[PDB]
Amino acid sequence: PQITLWKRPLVTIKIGGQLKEALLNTGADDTVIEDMSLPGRWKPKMIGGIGGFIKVRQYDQIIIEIAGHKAIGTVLVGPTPVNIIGRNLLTQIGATLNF
């Protein structure tokens, strides 16, 4: 699709069998989702947002559907205001910015 930006670019994602909502986020390097159970091991990561740096759980090679497109990659789990799909997965679904 072509998504205009008058409203938040919210899409449905599917991860661990659960449907969730997430923001398509060109301003994020990484994908960050609210606390949920994911399979496998995780590793530590510090990410820096508008308010400062926080600790999150980094899960690699996680299967996730984004607006109907399958991606498999890194998902960070931690205290974010809204679920965000960052560039690591936007590239997998072939997303570009256009004007």
Q: Which positions touch a copy of itself (CB under 8 A)?
A: 1-6, 8-9, 23-29, 32, 47-54, 67, 69, 79-82, 84, 87, 90-91, 93-99
Which residue in 11, 13, 15, 30 binds ligand 017 (CB under 6 A)? Answer: 30
Q: Could you tell me if 5 and 65 are in contact, meaning their C-beta atoms sit under 8 angstroms apart?
A: no
Block residue for tokens 């919210």: 10
Pairing of strands 43-49, 18-24: unpaired
- Residue 39 interacts with which of a copy of itself, ligand 017, none, CB < 5 to 8 Å by class: none
Cβ-contact 58, 43 below 8 angstroms: yes
Q: How far is the CB of 9 from ligand 017 (least distance, A)?
A: 11
Contact between 59 and ligand 017 per CB under 6 A: no
Give the contacts of 70 (CB within 8 A, at least 6 positions apart).
Answer: 63, 64
Please report how close the Cβ of residue 47 comes to a copy of itself at its closest, in angstroms.
Answer: 6
Which tokens hold the place of 65?
A: 């559907």
Q: Closer to ligand 017 by CB, 17 or 34: give it.
A: 34
